[PDB]
């Protein structure tokens, strides 16, 4: 068969930051060539593996994670990076074997009023663990007094949405991010490049 990497990259819609969307790719053969050919990607940064030897390598599983963040926050999606998104919304381990790819999505992910469909985890009590998702909508108990379900002084919504206007600057302009995590457990190698 053929690995459906392109479906992830060419998906019509992409997941929000508040919940990254992950698809596990297994028992297929992929050409990493199509990814490196395309000039669409603004960010092609590989951590823990050289891109050249990827086709030669065989991986037990290959996970593709999809989300849409503001362009500057793309730098946050990297090993050992401290930020609101990296610490809370989506986290990458210090030992990371995979690549981060990103392209501008202002053509599709922005409206004149702004798209509020994609949101980030503004407040969380503890930093999220690597490769973990939390969609909790409990109001942040910033105050000593409990929130008791009401938005109030020292009480804050867990999430806040980007407002994506095409006129907005590149950092605030949307960027679409695919994270490729390469998994080599002590298991049979399901995914390999034909070469």
């Amino acid at each position, epitope marked *: 068969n053929l690995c459906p990497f392109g479906e992830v990259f060419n998906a019509t819609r992409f997941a929000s930051v508040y919940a990254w969307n992950r698809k596990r790719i297994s028992n297929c053969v992929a050409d990493y060539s199509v990814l*490196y050919n395309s000039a669409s990607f603004s960010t*092609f*940064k*590989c*951590y*823990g*593996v*050289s*891109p*050249t*030897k990827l086709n030669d390598l065989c991986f037990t599983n290959v996970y593709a994670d999809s989300f849409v963040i503001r362009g*500057d*926050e793309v*730098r*946050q999606i*990297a*090993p*050992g*990076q*401290t*930020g*609101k998104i990296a*610490d809370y919304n989506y986290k990458l381990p*210090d*030992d990371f074997t995979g690549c981060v790819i990103a392209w501008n999505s202002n053509n599709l992910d922005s409206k004149v009023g702004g798209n509020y469909n994609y949101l980030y985890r503004l407040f969380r009590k503890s*930093n999220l663990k690597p490769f973990e998702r939390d969609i909790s909508t409990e109001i942040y108990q910033a105050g000593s007094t409990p929130c008791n379900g009401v938005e109030g002084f020292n009480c804050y919504f867990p999430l806040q949405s980007y407002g994506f206007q095409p006129t907005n*600057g590149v*950092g*605030y302009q949307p960027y679409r991010v695919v994270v490729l995590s390469f998994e080599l457990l002590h298991a049979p190698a399901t995914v390999c490049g034909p070469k």
Partner: antibody
Amino acid sequence: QVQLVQSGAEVKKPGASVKVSCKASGYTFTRYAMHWVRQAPGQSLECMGWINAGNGNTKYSKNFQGRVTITRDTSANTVYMELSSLRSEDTAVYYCARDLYYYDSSGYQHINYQLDYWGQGTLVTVSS
Amino acid sequence: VMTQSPGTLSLSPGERATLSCRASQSVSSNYLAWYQQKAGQAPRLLIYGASSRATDIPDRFSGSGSGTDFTLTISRLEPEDFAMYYCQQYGGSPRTFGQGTKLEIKR
């Protein structure tokens, strides 16, 4: 936590050699790179060079070149800066900092400009 | 070098302070990063990439990027904010650190 620990303050006679050590903790030593930045008293920061802990590969600034050697020990997660033939102008505070290295699609290593964490700083007084 | 102005920028408590870094070929669409240095202590990063903040940085700190130049913003001034602030980027020559601006408050 992520901790960078630097050697104690040093007093050295002119023309001698200073060796300043930066310990690493809380992160994978090989996966990040170490930069050394010097602050002369009441002056701006200057990046002397960068060590890649995995590769051992070194690059140096031209102004400080000819005196600075930056080394590494994989075992103790400790990076060393050595400066030699100290001039009086050399007296400064020297810092160690951590930069992620990334890989381009062609496979060549590159340094992320961000200096995420900093060492406490070792002071070198050069006095007759 | 990178133009960080002035050598001293002074601001009243509760006011908003703006620190400016400008360069032509250093920025070159590359990233600009800001650090905070308290008196007698090593620099601590405040903003990386001019719009993203590390953890343990209060929300009052904020940044912007405008082509050749970028800025550091402290909307609310507190005694703790008293420090020397720096800007960094990469150029054709190795990475460049700005001269730095000292922030002062009325007391």
